[PDB]
Design an enzyme around this catalytic site. Structure first.
Site, PDB file in Angstrom:
ATOM      1  N   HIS A   1       0.696  -1.415   0.246  1.00 18.96           N
ATOM      2  CA  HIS A   1       0.180  -0.402   0.165  1.00 18.96           C
ATOM      3  C   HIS A   1       1.099   1.208   0.279  1.00 18.96           C
ATOM      4  CE1 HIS A   1       0.532   0.047   4.200  1.00 18.96           C
ATOM      5  NE2 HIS A   1       0.523   1.086   4.089  1.00 18.96           N
TER       6      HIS A   1
ATOM      7  N   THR B   1       0.572   5.101   1.832  1.00 17.85           N
ATOM      8  CA  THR B   1      -0.981   5.700   2.685  1.00 17.85           C
ATOM      9  C   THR B   1      -0.680   6.812   2.086  1.00 17.85           C
ATOM     10  OG1 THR B   1       0.738   4.326   4.792  1.00 17.85           O
ATOM     11  CG2 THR B   1      -0.874   6.316   5.382  1.00 17.85           C
TER      12      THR B   1
ATOM     13  N   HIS C   1       5.320   6.853  -1.117  1.00 13.64           N
ATOM     14  CA  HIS C   1       6.408   4.755  -0.476  1.00 13.64           C
ATOM     15  C   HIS C   1       5.438   3.889  -0.876  1.00 13.64           C
ATOM     16  CE1 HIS C   1       5.874   5.862   2.991  1.00 13.64           C
ATOM     17  NE2 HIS C   1       6.302   4.913   3.361  1.00 13.64           N
TER      18      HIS C   1
ATOM     19  N   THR D   1       5.847   0.520   1.399  1.00  8.50           N
ATOM     20  CA  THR D   1       7.293  -0.091   2.090  1.00  8.50           C
ATOM     21  C   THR D   1       7.496  -1.033   1.724  1.00  8.50           C
ATOM     22  OG1 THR D   1       6.542   1.303   4.315  1.00  8.50           O
ATOM     23  CG2 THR D   1       7.383  -0.861   4.342  1.00  8.50           C
TER      24      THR D   1
END
Length: 213
Positions: A65, A67, A144, A146
């Protein structure tokens, strides 16, 4: 009536597998690269080779994902204001294409840089007390995905790590590429920091929605 833990773009199964594999290949290539090997001292204060897939042992289990706004169910500052925007409510459940421009690695995290379109930038939060790490940089630069974290690190680090990597490219300090990987040019920003500029931006599909834990 409470908010999610966070809002974000959640990658499709297919797109998550694709980026996940890209990240892993990058970790196996980076760890084998002689430019990385000769800098291991600036990486771990621990002569044999480091296996980065193992190093970044805390990884997302399933779908990846990006965020937008961490809400902590409404405990976070600006969570309600964010959740209440028309664009957020309107965008809830819609598909987006996210462009990943680079993969990166530090002693703390591995992640992928997301370059938001201006439409998607409308879903990026306008925080009322801004980070001095973020500041100086165009909004949404923190965006970004992760890929992994070292044992002692919380995955929120990844975003600070990326802003740091970018603070330096802002000062034209990325320097000269120290390598050519099949997917792009390898940059050594020092202090254990590495960045792969993808020749071709990966495109991933994702749904904008809220995650509730």
């Amino acid at each position: 009536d409470f908010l999610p833990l966070y809002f974000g773009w959640f990658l499709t199964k297919k797109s998550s597998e694709t980026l996940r594999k890209a990240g892993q290949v990058f970790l196996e290539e980076l760890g084998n690269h002689k430019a990385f090997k000769k800098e291991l001292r600036h990486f771990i204060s621990g002569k044999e080779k480091l296996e980065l897939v193992s190093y970044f042992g805390k990884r997302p289990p399933g779908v990846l994902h990006c965020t937008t706004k961490f809400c902590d169910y409404g405990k976070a500052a600006g969570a309600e204001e964010y959740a209440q925007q028309e664009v957020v409510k309107r965008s809830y459940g819609k598909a987006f294409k996210l462009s990943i421009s680079a993969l990166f690695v530090t002693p703390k995290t591995a992640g992928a840089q997301v370059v938001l379109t201006d439409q998607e930038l409308q879903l990026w939060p306008s925080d009322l007390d801004k980070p001095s790490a973020s500041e100086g940089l165009p909004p949404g630069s923190r965006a970004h995905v992760t890929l992994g974290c070292a044992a002692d690190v919380q995955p929120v680090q990844t975003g600070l790590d990326l802003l740091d990597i970018l603070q330096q490219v802002k000062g034209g300090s990325q320097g000269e590429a120290v390598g050519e990987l099949p997917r792009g040019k390898l940059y050594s920003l020092g202090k254990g920091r590495w960045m792969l500029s993808l020749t071709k931006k990966m495109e991933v599909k994702a749904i904008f929605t809220g995650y509730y834990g």
